[PDB]
């Protein structure tokens, strides 16, 4: 007990986790809403947030796959963590305007 | 109990052994990976 | 007399020499030498430089 | 696809392995679903998305879908497993089923 | 686990030292949190623990 | 601090991992160098101001 601070015992807990795209079993306190398809929505799938339209996908995910990524490494497909269905993500609607 | 005898030869692996590098679905892409 | 052609040669040579001399610039880092940065700092701080 | 071919019956003694096959044009390119129908009973899903079991289905059930054929494998076939097994796939928002197979437990 | 206070800096990616080399090593690409607190009131004894 | 002492360190082998034993400080605060790389380096001189 008489030791200086730098010579005193310290209890250490190291928490290591994975933030890569994968199925998840540990989650924070967060209430889930219903699933809306075919409308432009903000969405949050297991922490992956974005905006776009959700439609039913024919992509055949393997069971270890939760997300699908496009050429620009943007998520364009997601497995729903409750229904386990595969969903396509498409940007809502946009275009240039000239006056 | 030592009771097994083993013989060995040598062959070619061709292009076997490729595995999925991560858990992300991909399609219509050429993906470069170091592993 | 052939000043134009010698000018082409000289411009290319000076461009390459300028490129070589730019390797001694720190660009805001502690050193312009990668080996010194790696020998003096640990991984996390070395990566910034 | 559009026609899920399936053997008419499979004969298995208790404790052995049953292997019910579902075939169809590039069936490995779609998800496969298996249902267990018992006499005078409603259908019961046992396999979804090729190789996944709903909660409560016995650990002995397993499946695969490669090439153009999906198979249902009941290892250690018990007497309860006596039932009629079906094979299903989706096509353009329409559900397609197979003929069916009676798993006989001796 | 338990270490002494001046070794807590070693519980981090990219570190060296006795603890980081021979006892507990974190990867360079570590993703997570390190929680350390003084425990002098439980892990110290008059004669030494 | 007004009459701070300066000591010259030269012609010796410096193991900086032993400094944690002489004083109960929590960590070094270094400049232009990292504490864990000191043992890999050489210096013309060292001065210790206290
Ligand atoms: C992907 O699956 C579809 C389903 O019929 C098939 O028509 C198509 O040829 C498949 N693609 C490849 C590259 O085999």
From Swiss-Prot, chain A:
Q: In the UniProt annotation, what is the result of changing residue 21 to P?
A: Increased resistance to human covalescent sera neutralization
Give positions of region: Disordered. Answer: 21-43
Give each disulfide bond as a residue pair: 40-92
Tell me what happens on changing residue 72 to D: In strain: Alpha/B.1.1.7
Subunit field text = Binds to host ACE2. RBD also interacts with the N-linked glycan on 'Asn-90' of ACE2. Cleavage of S generates a polybasic C-terminal sequence on S1 that binds to host Neuropilin-1 (NRP1) and Neuropilin-2 (NRP2) receptors. Interacts with host integrin alpha-5/beta-1 (ITGA5:ITGB1) and with ACE2 in complex with integrin alpha-5/beta-1 (ITGA5:ITGB1). May interact via cytoplasmic c-terminus with M protein. May interact (via N-terminus) with host bilirubin and biliverdin, thereby preventing antibody binding to the SARS-CoV-2 spike NTD via an allosteric mechanism.
What functional role does this protein have? Attaches the virion to the cell membrane by interacting with host receptor, initiating the infection. The major receptor is host ACE2. When S2/S2' has been cleaved, binding to the receptor triggers direct fusion at the cell membrane. When S2/S2' has not been cleaved, binding to the receptor results in internalization of the virus by endocytosis using host TFRC and GRM2 and leading to fusion of the virion membrane with the host endosomal membrane. Alternatively, may use NRP1/NRP2 and integrin as entry receptors.
What name has this protein been given in UniProt?
Spike protein S1
Q: Which organism is it from?
A: Severe acute respiratory syndrome coronavirus 2
Its gene name is S
**Parent-protein residues present:** 499 to 597 of 1273
Curated annotation (Swiss-Prot), chain B:
Q: Which residues are glycosylated?
A: 2
Q: How does it assemble?
A: Binds to host ACE2. RBD also interacts with the N-linked glycan on 'Asn-90' of ACE2. Cleavage of S generates a polybasic C-terminal sequence on S1 that binds to host Neuropilin-1 (NRP1) and Neuropilin-2 (NRP2) receptors. Interacts with host integrin alpha-5/beta-1 (ITGA5:ITGB1) and with ACE2 in complex with integrin alpha-5/beta-1 (ITGA5:ITGB1). May interact via cytoplasmic c-terminus with M protein. May interact (via N-terminus) with host bilirubin and biliverdin, thereby preventing antibody binding to the SARS-CoV-2 spike NTD via an allosteric mechanism.
Q: What is this protein's function?
A: Attaches the virion to the cell membrane by interacting with host receptor, initiating the infection. The major receptor is host ACE2. When S2/S2' has been cleaved, binding to the receptor triggers direct fusion at the cell membrane. When S2/S2' has not been cleaved, binding to the receptor results in internalization of the virus by endocytosis using host TFRC and GRM2 and leading to fusion of the virion membrane with the host endosomal membrane. Alternatively, may use NRP1/NRP2 and integrin as entry receptors.
Name this protein carries in UniProt: Spike protein S1
Query: What is the source species?
Result: Severe acute respiratory syndrome coronavirus 2
């Amino acid at each position: 007990p008489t030791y200086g601070v730098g010579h005193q015992p310290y209890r250490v807990v190291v928490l290591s986790f994975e933030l890569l795209h994968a199925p998840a079993t540990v989650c924070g306190p967060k209430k889930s809403t219903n699933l809306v398809k075919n409308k432009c929505v903000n969405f949050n799938f297991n922490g992956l947030t974005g905006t776009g339209v959700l439609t039913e996908s024919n992509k055949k995910f393997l069971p270890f796959q939760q997300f699908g990524r496009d050429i620009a490494d943007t998520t364009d497909a997601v497995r729903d963590p409750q229904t386990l269905e595969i969903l396509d993500i498409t940007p809502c609607s946009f275009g240039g305007v000239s006056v | 109990v030592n009771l097994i005898t083993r013989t060995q030869s040598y062959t070619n692996s061709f292009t076997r052994g490729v595995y999925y590098p991560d858990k992300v679905f991909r399609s219509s892409v050429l993906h470069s990976t170091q592993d | 007399a052939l000043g134009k052609l010698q000018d082409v040669v000289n411009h290319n040579a000076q461009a390459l020499n300028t490129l070589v001399k730019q390797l001694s610039s720190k660009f805001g880092a502690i050193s312009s030498v990668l080996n010194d940065i790696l020998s003096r700092l640990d991984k996390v701080e070395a990566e910034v430089q | 696809p559009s026609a899920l071919t399936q053997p008419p019956s499979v004969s298995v003694s208790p404790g052995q392995t049953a292997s019910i096959t579902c075939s169809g044009d590039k069936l490995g390119n779609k998800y496969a679903y298996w249902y267990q129908q018992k006499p005078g009973q409603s259908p019961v899903l046992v396999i979804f998305q090729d190789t996944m079991r709903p909660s409560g289905i016995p650990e002995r059930f397993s499946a695969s879908n490669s090439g153009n054929t999906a198979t249902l494998t009941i290892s250690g076939t018990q007497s309860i497993d006596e039932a009629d097994y079906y094979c299903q796939a989706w096509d353009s928002n329409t559900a397609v089923f197979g003929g069916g197979t009676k798993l006989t437990v001796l | 686990f338990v270490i002494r206070g001046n070794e807590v800096s070693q519980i981090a990616p990219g570190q060296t030292g006795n603890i980081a080399d021979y006892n507990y090593k974190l990867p360079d690409d570590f993703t997570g949190c390190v929680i350390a607190w003084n425990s002098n009131k439980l892990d110290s004894k008059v004669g030494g623990n | 601090v007004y009459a701070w002492n300066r000591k010259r360190i030269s012609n010796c082998v410096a193991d900086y991992s032993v400094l944690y034993n002489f004083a109960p400080f929590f960590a070094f605060k270094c400049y232009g160098v990292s504490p864990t790389k000191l043992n890999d380096l050489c210096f013309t001189n060292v001065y210790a101001d206290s």
